[PDB]
Design a protein around this ligand. Structure first.
Ligand SMILES: OC[C@@H]1O[C@@H](O[C@@H]2[C@@H](O)[C@H](O[C@@H]3CO[C@@H](O)[C@H](O)[C@H]3O)OC[C@H]2O)[C@H](O)[C@H]1O
Ligand SMILES: OC[C@@H]1O[C@@H](O[C@@H]2[C@@H](O)[C@H](O[C@@H]3CO[C@@H](O)[C@H](O)[C@H]3O)OC[C@H]2O)[C@H](O)[C@H]1O
Ligand SMILES: OC[C@@H]1O[C@@H](O[C@@H]2[C@@H](O)[C@H](O[C@@H]3CO[C@@H](O)[C@H](O)[C@H]3O)OC[C@H]2O)[C@H](O)[C@H]1O
Ligand SMILES: OC[C@@H]1O[C@@H](O[C@@H]2[C@@H](O)[C@H](O[C@@H]3CO[C@@H](O)[C@H](O)[C@H]3O)OC[C@H]2O)[C@H](O)[C@H]1O
Ligand SMILES: OC[C@@H]1O[C@@H](O[C@@H]2[C@@H](O)[C@H](O[C@@H]3CO[C@@H](O)[C@H](O)[C@H]3O)OC[C@H]2O)[C@H](O)[C@H]1O
Ligand SMILES: OC[C@@H]1O[C@@H](O[C@@H]2[C@@H](O)[C@H](O[C@@H]3CO[C@@H](O)[C@H](O)[C@H]3O)OC[C@H]2O)[C@H](O)[C@H]1O
Ligand SMILES: OC[C@@H]1O[C@@H](O[C@@H]2[C@@H](O)[C@H](O[C@@H]3CO[C@@H](O)[C@H](O)[C@H]3O)OC[C@H]2O)[C@H](O)[C@H]1O
Ligand SMILES: OC[C@@H]1O[C@@H](O[C@@H]2[C@@H](O)[C@H](O[C@@H]3CO[C@@H](O)[C@H](O)[C@H]3O)OC[C@H]2O)[C@H](O)[C@H]1O
Ligand SMILES: OC[C@@H]1O[C@@H](O[C@@H]2[C@@H](O)[C@H](O[C@@H]3CO[C@@H](O)[C@H](O)[C@H]3O)OC[C@H]2O)[C@H](O)[C@H]1O
Ligand SMILES: OC[C@@H]1O[C@@H](O[C@@H]2[C@@H](O)[C@H](O[C@@H]3CO[C@@H](O)[C@H](O)[C@H]3O)OC[C@H]2O)[C@H](O)[C@H]1O
Ligand SMILES: OC[C@@H]1O[C@@H](O[C@@H]2[C@@H](O)[C@H](O[C@@H]3CO[C@@H](O)[C@H](O)[C@H]3O)OC[C@H]2O)[C@H](O)[C@H]1O
Ligand SMILES: OC[C@@H]1O[C@@H](O[C@@H]2[C@@H](O)[C@H](O[C@@H]3CO[C@@H](O)[C@H](O)[C@H]3O)OC[C@H]2O)[C@H](O)[C@H]1O
Ligand SMILES: [Cl-]
Ligand SMILES: [Cl-]
Ligand SMILES: [Cl-]
Ligand SMILES: [Cl-]
Ligand SMILES: [Cl-]
Ligand SMILES: [Cl-]
Ligand SMILES: [Cl-]
Ligand SMILES: [Cl-]
Ligand SMILES: [Cl-]
Ligand SMILES: [Cl-]
Ligand SMILES: [Cl-]
Ligand SMILES: [Cl-]
Ligand SMILES: [Cl-]
Ligand SMILES: [Cl-]
Ligand SMILES: [Cl-]
Lengths: 134, 134, 134, 134, 134, 134
């Protein structure tokens, strides 16, 4: 899957230099592709496995979303697990709730990805994405 | 209404993940159904309202044709307004002229929809559709 | 939510002067109201956040249940995390197992709240409550 | 591997007199067993090789699914290649998309196997199978 | 809950490829875990909901016990409803009476699960299970 | 008699869903009580009869210690007979030697009971108990 920003249409979640961001015209395009697997800490949730680096996962660290090779620890698995919920800014879209910080959601901010509290209308838009099957 | 491609018969304009494309055997079939209303920026034109998502309209953005929730601005309304003209490759069919970019028409290219300049014979066929009432 | 004692109907869990007890005719009634949040030490458990004082949680300290402002330590979060299990004195009601003392449960005694081992029939009634949504 | 019909539980894909069908209580049971090999026309897909007759493959011909001895042609290899997709009638089961007819899927009809367009709810169930390792 | 066979101790009811059976050393072990809910056709009975596949239930079909996604029909709900009774071979254990075939009980036979009439001492043991809370 | 673990004091051998384990605060307490009778296969040894379930005995099966209704076979009696010996980790306490597997002793492991070889210092403690008359 790829994931498009709802308020920056044409921009996709991607990994660059092992950090998460959103970008248009993602090059290489595989940087925006993920294998969605049952959540490492909770199978009702999801984890994002990198397509170009198998065994690496999106995960938060100091509340920034980075890409990191799997580590056999509860904290890594919990940092790498996200619950898909109806989109904050549009219930027909999606948002990603952090498993171990349930009041923080994946959002972009100056085009970089964080997990942060969602309080304003701009926060909600920044936290709302479109899932695309490739 | 559904809209069938004239050079890919059996392929229909449809929304997938809030983006416009043409596909055959559209699943679910409602993805290819639209409520045609008077153009949001000009009643002599038309706008394509989603049957699945009322209040969402086909609209161009970065010249890509996408589905987006109605916004109360002139630019959104214009981006969502299209003039039905006689088909570029066949006057018995129709083409869709963009209200705010009059030299650009809805066309498919690698099965995704854009508003682009119609120059060659392939361009004309890619921009020529058949309107089917349902 | 509010929580009514099973063996003292009309007595609800409440905070008074930042310590936990059960009282009837709770004045002000907001003292008996809690926001049930994901468990601070484990999201599959619960914590009781004060409605009157956001950011304050019921938690045990020297095995007394008190209300205390959040502190960013593992011990505080574990002291503030409880597992909802079927009621000791009635399986259709509920009891609250301590996260870090798994054989101690919230119970009243002289109308004050403790986490204690649950041994007698009176112990079980003292540890059994009725959840009431508000 | 054997493949059980999702709507006719206990009915398995089997070869009878070199023709594909679904049957209960398959005798000999080897007629329902296949070696899943890299797709003859595309190693990222699959082909079904006969366990009873090595070098024979399930392949479609005039849209009927039959068992045929390998032939060294592009058409044969394409007729014998299928893509495993999430099941039409259940995402946790599987369906088999034809490699050279990408909008046709293996389905049973009067207990015989075809590749056909999948339009109705009955079509989707007829096209949905349960893989069973042996 | 999981459910252990009384005459094959260490063998548990589990789902494998959407069919019920008993197996030792169940892998993955969640295949043997169920959420016990009020009977879909009668609240005084029980239904077994899959932990692995939420919204899927154990239900009999041609008297075989299978796993199937919930369907909004009386027949499905009745096929998925079972009454817990004292065990046929041991009153301290349990058996499962079919709601709509009241003389048929869940039993294993060649390690596969059916609902069948219980007549012999072997039948009774085959229909007697141990409930284990997990 | 009850039998307390030497390395987990306050934890007692008990039967839960007809399987052997050690638990503190055993509930109901009769789950930890046994009638010590002369060994079923050798009256100079002992067998543990259930107080809750007269005629049921602790016995090993697949080297797991379980509770099972008496069976009139030599193998059952052999599986249910144990010899009290000086404790592996404390000669003032006791251990239980399997009668038909004389190098295997009752030990707890992840709080469940097995008959296993006693090799390490952890093994010896896991195999050492305090008998308490009731
Ligand atoms: O994303 C939120 C949590 O952050 C990680 O845990 C952090 C941990 O990374 C942090 O380490 C800091 C990093 O900066 C150094 O200069 C400092 O010395 C060091 O202590 O400590 C706080 C802790 O919360 C988790 O992966 C994630 O859950
Ligand atoms: O991720 C894209 C958008 O980025 C955020 O909005 C930014 C906003 O953060 C930025 O403000 C800058 C921040 O740095 C300050 O020093 C500066 O003064 C200020 O102008 O302005 C641009 C805007 O795009 C949104 O969260 C997100 O949508
Ligand atoms: O489909 C044609 C027109 O495209 C949209 O307008 C675009 C607009 O999206 C674009 O915004 C850019 C975003 O990136 C910034 O760096 C830049 O400064 C900003 O201008 O601007 C170009 C414009 O063509 C309209 O919806 C649609 O009419
Ligand atoms: O929308 C369906 C048809 O797509 C266009 O024609 C395409 C054509 O674009 C494609 O050429 C490929 C495109 O990707 C490039 O990267 C590559 O270099 C080029 O070879 O060939 C297939 C054909 O389907 C038409 O506009 C439209 O009819
Ligand atoms: O409710 C059970 C546990 O009680 C608290 O832990 C206590 C801890 O508060 C106590 O600390 C004392 C504080 O005063 C100092 O002078 C003294 O040296 C120090 O030991 O020690 C006992 C311990 O049980 C926890 O919050 C809670 O888990
Ligand atoms: O929380 C309400 C109830 O309080 C406890 O029961 C109390 C009990 O503790 C109390 O016992 C006193 C102890 O002091 C002695 O001097 C006196 O004689 C004795 O009566 O008596 C009142 C009774 O309500 C329960 O745990 C709980 O239900
Ligand atoms: O299953 C779908 C396609 O069916 C086969 O292709 C058939 C082909 O076999 C058929 O050939 C006939 C054979 O007899 C000749 O006398 C006659 O001239 C010729 O037409 O023609 C139709 C075609 O669809 C493929 O194996 C398979 O892809
Ligand atoms: O492969 C098993 C099932 O077969 C199809 O459903 C059949 C259906 O085809 C059949 O209908 C017949 C059609 O012929 C008429 O003459 C007759 O009146 C009518 O009954 O009835 C049996 C039914 O099972 C499905 O595709 C497939 O599930
Ligand atoms: O487990 C007992 C019952 O089995 C299911 O109902 C069965 C049904 O599956 C079976 O279907 C056949 C399919 O072929 C058709 O030709 C025929 O008409 C039809 O009867 O029929 C018997 C019936 O008992 C129920 O889910 C369950 O109660
Ligand atoms: O589920 C485990 C046990 O299985 C049944 O007992 C079996 C018995 O059914 C089996 O007899 C075989 C069955 O398969 C036929 O092919 C064959 O004809 C017949 O001899 O023999 C093994 C025995 O354990 C019990 O109901 C159940 O306890
Ligand atoms: O606790 C140790 C010994 O275990 C019991 O006997 C076991 C026996 O139950 C087991 O036999 C099964 C028979 O069914 C087959 O399908 C299976 O392959 C086989 O493992 O095998 C081990 C044997 O020792 C005794 O009661 C006890 O002494
Ligand atoms: O019966 C209670 C005790 O259980 C056994 O020891 C357990 C041990 O089996 C369990 O395994 C873990 C696995 O993860 C590793 O990282 C960890 O170090 C390892 O110990 O851990 C808990 C421990 O209590 C003993 O036989 C028995 O005393
Ligand atoms: Cl994808
Ligand atoms: Cl219409
Ligand atoms: Cl041209
Ligand atoms: Cl509430
Ligand atoms: Cl609330
Ligand atoms: Cl309880
Ligand atoms: Cl296989
Ligand atoms: Cl193989
Ligand atoms: Cl599909
Ligand atoms: Cl497969
Ligand atoms: Cl359970
Ligand atoms: Cl039950
Ligand atoms: Cl009975
Ligand atoms: Cl005694
Ligand atoms: Cl010894």
């Amino acid at each position: 899957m790829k994931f498009e920003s709802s308020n920056y249409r044409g921009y996709y979640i991607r990994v660059k230099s092992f950090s998460g961001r959103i970008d248009p015209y993602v090059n290489p395009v595989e940087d925006s592709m993920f294998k969605i697997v049952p959540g490492l800490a909770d199978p009702s949730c999801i984890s994002f496995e990198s397509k170009t680096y198998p065994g690496y996962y999106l995960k938060h660290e100091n509340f920034r979303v980075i890409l990191k090779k799997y580590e056999d620890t509860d904290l890594f698995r919990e940092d790498a697990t996200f619950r898909v919920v109806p989109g904050w800014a549009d219930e027909n879209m999606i948002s990603f709730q952090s498993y171990n910080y349930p009041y923080r959601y994946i959002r972009h901010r100056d085009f970089e990805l964080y997990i942060e509290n969602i309080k304003t209308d701009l926060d909600r838009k920044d936290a709302t994405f479109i899932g695309i099957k490739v």
